[PDB]
Design a protein around this ligand. Structure first.
Ligand SMILES: CCCCCCCCO[C@@H]1O[C@H](CO)[C@@H](O)[C@H](O)[C@H]1O
Ligand SMILES: CCCCCCCCO[C@@H]1O[C@H](CO)[C@@H](O)[C@H](O)[C@H]1O
Ligand SMILES: CCCCCCCCO[C@@H]1O[C@H](CO)[C@@H](O)[C@H](O)[C@H]1O
Ligand SMILES: CCCCCCCCO[C@@H]1O[C@H](CO)[C@@H](O)[C@H](O)[C@H]1O
Ligand SMILES: CCCCCCCCO[C@@H]1O[C@H](CO)[C@@H](O)[C@H](O)[C@H]1O
Ligand SMILES: CCCCCCCCO[C@@H]1O[C@H](CO)[C@@H](O)[C@H](O)[C@H]1O
Ligand SMILES: CCCCCCCCO[C@@H]1O[C@H](CO)[C@@H](O)[C@H](O)[C@H]1O
Ligand SMILES: CCCCCCCCO[C@@H]1O[C@H](CO)[C@@H](O)[C@H](O)[C@H]1O
Lengths: 245, 245, 245, 245
């Protein structure tokens, strides 16, 4: 109904909001905790002052921002704001393959830009101390461990999306808040393991800005936040297709 | 349907509740943390004992109070309880320009009064230590940085409002809780940057009482919490008008 | 529709749940924080380890328990589970004066019993250290300050109830969660001031058990948690009657 | 409507998600707090860095995961994902006794597997330090105290389920989020007492993996997390049957 051009602008805004607010809270957490003493290496400083409370706070910053976006942009573009979701939807004939790349590009741009504008609001400390909320494996977590966390996490996100936003029997009006709260929950447990990206674009944004405004190069991890989410999403979409078949 | 006089009383009550409960939680946080040692200057004491957890708690105190007000006063006056929202609504022919000033004045009074009654409940420490939850740029944040944070923040608030309360296709009954939770999320990330006002009246109240009951004069910052929110709201309203056009 | 006898049993259960879970979380908080060092006297130990985060956690324990009860017992007795609400409803011809006392008595009993069973689960430390979550003015808060906090707090609770549960235009199904989240918000800001009772029975339960199983006598404060809530509720009910008249 | 075989797969997935995400957050909390100093023995380290905030965070990780599952798998199998609920439903002619064992077995397997996959993501520290989120009586809590906590807790969970998911008058679409938030609330207060299992399978999973990958043998406690929940659920189901009769 809405032109692909405007739906792409919407996806841009939605992913911008997602990275600005979600990743922003993570960065800010590290900034107000910087200089504190951690009990052990696993605690990189996010759960330093508020324990798991800090992780639920970050998860909620993501969740509420996501819910708000879905309610604001859902009717416009469907508010995927996540490459893995677009692909997941695509994998079960729920989204036109012809629009997959356009959306993904708008998502990637929005994420990059969202991370950039936040970096301007909070100063350079957000990048040099908060790392702009970039998702990377945590201390003691191997490459495949983070991979696994990302597929199980994105699996939950997608199967929830399938059940509450795609299935025709879903309760109207609940998709936005449920999808958001679900992400908040996944981040609460999987955050201190892989950072709980569940979104290739959510990771892309921070990575990019982190490299340009900091001598950082986290790209040797990106594959985790690309393959993991995509595999998790498609697995969920198909699984749900089978269970309701 | 309801007389402008009663809808103004409603706006008064709604903004009173907003400042009393929201700004109140911020003040209280500083009061129970006063005397503690902070890791660095950025942490002014709000995330001292609970990290980002303290910010989500403050955001939720705002959010739940806002949701409650919208459900209690929405049918009466529309529950704008925010000058920027009234103006934003106005900017897209969704509110009578003739009532803009009346509402804004009721909002400003309610906010001032709300801050005043809270100051009486918690004693003068709420003002001399908690600063009554007044929003001011945080340590290391320049004037334009706070400005930017406020427009991006209010942009999200308004576009959400446009999508869930103004658009005729919005899910009935969700506006209240969604708008509230959205504010809670914005405050979680933008709080330790500009205090996350998003509301000229929410700032006015505390500023006023802070000056009268404390040798404080934060008015050299007020422009941030006036221009920032208004610009963000109007930008959001128009953007949403374009995307759905 | 349901017999007064069964609706009284329901009120009993609902208030039992309210005090068991809500007041219980407060007690538990003090128990896991006991032995810690506080920054100042205002911080009695509740915001010691989690700052305001601890207050929102307690507020949510109350809120979620309240929402659950309203969804479980609402259709049975209306789930007042609060003398002030019953009276408030009564004050605007929304509840039979003939049933006011019966409900209030079931609420008082349920609260007393709820506090008693919790005391058995957590041991006597819940009473000697957690005080069973009894609401009393906080350090530096005078008698009238707590009084004021309780009327403003209960005012919000009731006007929300009026708007979302009594008004015929309210969105169906939202009353439970909204009422609950509203209480969670009031407790977040007003908790460290008066303990944020908003409910004569919620206070009665703990007070009683605290006296019987601890040399405590907080009854010289009870009037605050009786008059404050009742005045706040009636004021809200009438105010809402006027604004919608 | 859906084959018992697919509904069993669903129950498997739902309980997997429940244990993976819920119990996972508890384990992670202990891992980021390990090495810290506790105020007293009651605080085993979960409320160490975030106070009660840590408990609400764990409760929410459970709640959001539970809500998401109910929205994703509810239409498929009813999403019991808890032996006590299946039995409770059974006890009031709301579920076929012939399917009770099948569901319970899928739940038990899912829980065991869910705990296993999480153990792989977070490394062995999740088991040797976080105990995989296994529920056991807390310091100073006797066997019958934990038992009581579990029946009162599961009583609330079930009566809420009865009111919002079983009763034909329940508001459509609210069951998922309400059931989830209710669990989050029960865990917030009852967690530091018995760990707040409310689910024989949620306990089984961790116990099993804890024994196999750690010299742990918590099975001398399991009866608490079997009898307690079942008794609480049945008591709630019958009580609700009586009150609405
Ligand atoms: C990692 C897997 C990504 C899969 C996304 C594939 C997007 C391309 O999808 C293809 O686009 C074409 C037009 O451009 C259409 O004609 C094809 O039918 C469609 O399948
Ligand atoms: C961009 C192309 C990505 C292809 C996916 C490569 C996955 C292999 O990735 C490698 O796996 C090893 C495990 O044996 C790890 O030890 C290495 O650190 C990791 O980089
Ligand atoms: C910062 C920008 C604030 C814009 C708010 C403008 C409110 C005035 O708005 C004006 O009010 C008049 C009656 O008073 C009406 O007759 C005009 O049509 C209306 O535009
Ligand atoms: C009340 C009228 C407000 C007009 C808006 C004025 C905005 C200029 O504001 C000024 O911008 C400077 C940046 O160059 C900052 O360094 C100053 O601190 C700031 O006050
Ligand atoms: C603190 C104020 C409490 C007011 C509650 C008053 C409850 C009594 O209310 C009265 O009960 C009588 C039967 O018992 C009825 O016949 C009366 O009409 C009714 O007003
Ligand atoms: C049970 C009957 C209660 C009647 C209400 C009495 C209210 C007066 O209460 C008193 O107010 C004084 C303020 O001047 C305080 O200093 C006292 O501590 C307080 O008890
Ligand atoms: C701890 C109590 C557990 C009760 C669960 C009982 C499940 C068995 O229930 C029984 O299953 C039979 C078929 O297998 C049916 O024919 C019976 O009617 C049914 O009652
Ligand atoms: C698997 C079969 C379980 C049967 C339930 C047994 C309940 C008794 O359990 C016992 O109760 C005692 C209290 O007197 C406690 O002191 C013991 O530690 C406890 O194991």
């Amino acid at each position: 109904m809405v032109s692909l051009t405007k739906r792409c602008i919407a996806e841009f805004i939605g992913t911008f909001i997602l990275v600005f607010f979600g990743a922003g809270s993570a960065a800010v957490t590290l900034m107000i905790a910087s200089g504190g003493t951690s009990p052990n290496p696993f605690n990189i400083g996010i759960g330093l002052l508020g324990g798991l409370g800090d992780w639920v706070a970050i998860g909620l910053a993501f969740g509420f921002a996501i819910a708000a976006s879905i309610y604001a942009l859902g009717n416009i573009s469907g508010c995927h704001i996540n490459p893995a979701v677009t692909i997941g939807l695509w994998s079960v004939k729920k989204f036109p393959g012809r629009e997959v790349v356009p959306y993904i590009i708008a998502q990637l741009l929005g994420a990059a830009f969202g991370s950039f504008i936040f970096l301007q609001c909070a100063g350079i400390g957000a990048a040099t101390v908060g790392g702009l909320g970039a998702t990377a494996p945590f201390p003691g977590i191997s490459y495949w461990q983070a991979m696994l966390a990302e597929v199980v996490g994105t699996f939950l996100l997608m199967i929830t999306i399938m059940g509450i936003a795609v299935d025709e029997r879903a309760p109207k009006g609940f998709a936005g808040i449920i999808i958001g709260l679900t992400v908040a929950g996944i981040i609460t447990t999987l955050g201190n393991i892989s950072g709980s990206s569940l979104n290739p674009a959510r990771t892309f944004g921070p990575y990019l800005n982190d490299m340009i405004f900091a001598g950082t190069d986290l790209w040797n991890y990106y594959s985790i936040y690309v393959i993991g989410p995509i595999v998790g999403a498609v697995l969920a979409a198909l699984t749900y297709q089978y269970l309701t078949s």
